[PDB]
Amino acid sequence: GLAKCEEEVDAIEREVELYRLNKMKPVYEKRDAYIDEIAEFWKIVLSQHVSFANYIRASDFKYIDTIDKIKVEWLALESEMYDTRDFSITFHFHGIEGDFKEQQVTKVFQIKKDGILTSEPVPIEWPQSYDSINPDLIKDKRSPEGKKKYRQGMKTIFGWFRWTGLKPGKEFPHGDSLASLFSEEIYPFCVKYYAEAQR
Amino acid sequence: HAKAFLGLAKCEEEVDAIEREVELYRLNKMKPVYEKRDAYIDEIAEFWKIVLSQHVSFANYIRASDFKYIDTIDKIKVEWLALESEMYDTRDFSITFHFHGIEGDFKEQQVTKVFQIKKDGILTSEPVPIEWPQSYDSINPDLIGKKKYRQGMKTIFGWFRWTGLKPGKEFPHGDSLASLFSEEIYPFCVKYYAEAQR
């Protein structure tokens, strides 16, 4: 009786989350089309954002300034095997010539069991300037200076592309909160942030 | 360049329309399920008594002497007003209580209180008649020194006259209690009853 009603409620909640996603999809497509015509749109938006700067390092800003595209996509539209909170984030970096490669990178975030957000590492080519803090390059990671170099690079935005949520205290700090920042604020409300930077 | 900005403004209109559309969609789907659920609940003896004692913060809103009267609730129904008319916010709702009553002290009675957004905007209400317990005669605003008035105004019966329009003058956190019923207690009552089983 009451148990069967409770299952119906969970069925209904997904149905409406799915209803929203399907309706929002074409609207985001149109919106992003306009966005692709505005020059420093994403640069302006990520500088305007209150909380975002706290997550990343100050030297990351020259590289995140080169972001000319952000695209969040909700995976529950792909399959009923995905939680409605599951999403991919696609970044395009224009790059910095002779330092940071022009590249497109997609990171996928999904619930594992309320459950927690997890991800997998995705390849991104680090800036040349970051060579000394590059975890794939640093030779002595246990040497006094090496430990601090490693830790510094793991705290950059490029460290976050390595984040999984499955190694507490070994990864980019609050990689999950940063992800939700994109899916819940930055990507949905970017236009509000751009108009705020306008006024 | 301003033509793009124009399209963005239209997109944000489209997003606001869509979000109300999905809210209405959820309310239409939930209504019949609640009805079926509540028919089973009506078969369970002290369901609401159990649920209201189980809830963490509910008791913090009301006086200790109120509990004997809230023990007599055998029906709580919440109905979302946006299903009536598109003139209501999707946050708008009425809440209907049935009190079994206490012989010689408290009448058996059914009371409906309506909550609605006025301008984000705030939750507001109008006073609804409720027959106070006769134990409360000395703290009944219709019977009253100003120590007693504030004591009655802090009871669950003071909440029934809460409006949200006289800040600092009414039942304290009447909006929070309202939102407790519509967002936690009524939606998730079966979960509270089940948590009381284990």
Side-chain angles (χ1 to χ4, degrees):
Chain A
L2 293 173
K4 336 300 142 195
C5 289
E6 293 296 301
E7 286 155 19
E8 244 151 281
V9 169
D10 290 1
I12 287 157
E13 297 294 341
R14 185 183 175 90
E15 195 182 316
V16 297
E17 303 271 351
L18 231 27
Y19 185 74
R20 185 202 277 111
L21 290 175
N22 276 308
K23 296 264 275 161
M24 291 291 277
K25 199 187 180 297
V27 177
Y28 279 138
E29 279 163 349
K30 276 89 237 154
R31 195 205 62 178
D32 294 359
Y34 291 118
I35 291 164
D36 295 323
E37 294 158 2
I38 307 163
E40 290 183 317
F41 183 91
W42 290 112
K43 175 206 218 274
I44 297 308
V45 171
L46 294 158
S47 295
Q48 176 60 46
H49 193 275
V50 285
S51 203
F52 172 73
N54 301 352
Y55 285 95
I56 61 164
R57 280 186 121 240
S59 38
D60 293 335
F61 275 112
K62 70 185 93 81
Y63 313 111
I64 300 170
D65 275 349
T66 73
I67 294 174
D68 59 280
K69 196 200 79 221
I70 303 173
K71 227 280 209 219
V72 175
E73 286 177 59
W74 279 268
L75 303 185
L77 287 179
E78 282 316 296
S79 174
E80 74 277 18
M81 294 304 212
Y82 286 112
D83 196 297
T84 52
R85 295 167 285 170
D86 297 358
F87 61 97
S88 60
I89 317 180
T90 295
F91 294 88
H92 187 265
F93 298 91
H94 181 71
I96 294 169
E97 218 170 333
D99 186 37
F100 180 54
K101 215 212 164 179
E102 183 268 320
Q103 53 194 316
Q104 182 165 121
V105 187
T106 303
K107 203 169 162 56
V108 175
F109 295 89
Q110 60 187 287
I111 300 296
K112 296 184 187 299
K113 292 193 173 157
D114 305 63
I116 71 163
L117 213 56
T118 64
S119 195
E120 301 176 28
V122 59
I124 179 162
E125 224 199 281
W126 286 49
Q128 269 211 70
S129 324
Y130 278 15
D131 274 355
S132 76
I133 61 172
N134 196 142
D136 288 358
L137 291 183
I138 300 170
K139 292 283 197 172
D140 303 310
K141 286 187 187 180
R142 51 170 89 242
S143 175
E145 311 170 359
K147 272 178 207 155
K148 93 170 178 298
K149 288 287 163 174
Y150 181 83
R151 221 148 46 189
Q152 278 163 15
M154 225 48 56
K155 283 179 206 308
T156 68
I157 194 63
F158 308 100
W160 177 73
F161 290 92
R162 222 157 262 254
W163 183 92
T164 68
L166 303 174
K167 265 87 189 156
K170 308 290 181 188
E171 312 193 306
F172 179 90
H174 316 122
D176 59 321
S177 304
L178 183 60
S180 297
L181 212 59
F182 282 103
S183 67
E184 290 172 11
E185 329 199 350
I186 287 154
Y187 179 79
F189 305 126
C190 55
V191 186
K192 300 199 204 301
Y193 290 107
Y194 186 86
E196 190 173 282
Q198 192 65 35
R199 73 188 280 122
Chain B
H1 183 283
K3 62 182 178 182
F5 268 90
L6 193 46
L8 295 168
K10 299 289 185 297
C11 279
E12 259 58 77
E13 295 166 12
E14 269 198 282
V15 167
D16 281 341
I18 283 168
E19 295 285 14
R20 195 205 152 85
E21 237 179 282
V22 297
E23 280 159 7
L24 269 147
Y25 181 91
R26 180 179 35 235
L27 296 180
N28 276 295
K29 294 260 173 179
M30 288 304 288
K31 166 168 180 279
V33 192
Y34 276 142
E35 286 170 351
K36 297 167 221 165
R37 187 202 72 182
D38 293 350
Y40 291 122
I41 290 174
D42 289 349
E43 293 172 41
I44 304 180
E46 294 178 1
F47 180 88
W48 286 115
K49 172 184 201 165
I50 309 301
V51 172
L52 291 172
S53 304
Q54 188 69 26
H55 192 276
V56 69
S57 46
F58 173 73
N60 301 324
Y61 288 84
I62 66 161
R63 303 312 219 102
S65 55
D66 288 338
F67 287 106
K68 74 183 88 91
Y69 308 109
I70 81 110
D71 278 2
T72 75
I73 297 160
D74 52 15
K75 187 254 226 217
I76 295 175
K77 198 196 172 177
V78 178
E79 293 166 61
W80 283 266
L81 303 180
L83 293 182
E84 294 308 88
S85 173
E86 296 295 80
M87 307 275 269
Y88 289 110
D89 199 286
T90 55
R91 286 169 291 172
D92 296 349
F93 68 95
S94 70
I95 185 167
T96 306
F97 300 86
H98 182 88
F99 301 87
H100 184 247
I102 304 185
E103 176 58 45
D105 191 30
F106 184 54
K107 279 188 194 161
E108 168 168 57
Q109 65 197 299
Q110 185 174 85
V111 193
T112 299
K113 199 170 165 58
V114 183
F115 293 87
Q116 46 178 302
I117 296 291
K118 292 181 179 305
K119 294 186 210 211
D120 188 305
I122 62 152
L123 217 56
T124 66
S125 197
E126 291 171 26
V128 65
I130 190 170
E131 186 88 6
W132 286 50
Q134 86 154 103
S135 299
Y136 278 24
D137 272 5
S138 70
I139 64 174
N140 185 163
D142 303 358
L143 295 180
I144 305 155
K146 271 144 179 175
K147 163 95 178 189
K148 286 286 174 193
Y149 177 85
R150 297 194 190 106
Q151 284 189 335
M153 225 42 50
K154 280 175 185 198
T155 70
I156 188 65
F157 307 97
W159 180 69
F160 284 91
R161 64 182 69 213
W162 184 89
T163 70
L165 304 174
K166 308 286 175 162
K169 311 286 174 176
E170 306 184 319
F171 181 90
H173 316 282
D175 51 304
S176 283
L177 179 53
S179 290
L180 211 65
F181 282 117
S182 77
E183 296 173 25
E184 295 180 37
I185 290 163
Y186 181 82
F188 309 132
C189 52
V190 179
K191 287 194 192 293
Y192 282 108
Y193 186 81
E195 202 194 1
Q197 291 327 102
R198 48 191 165 91

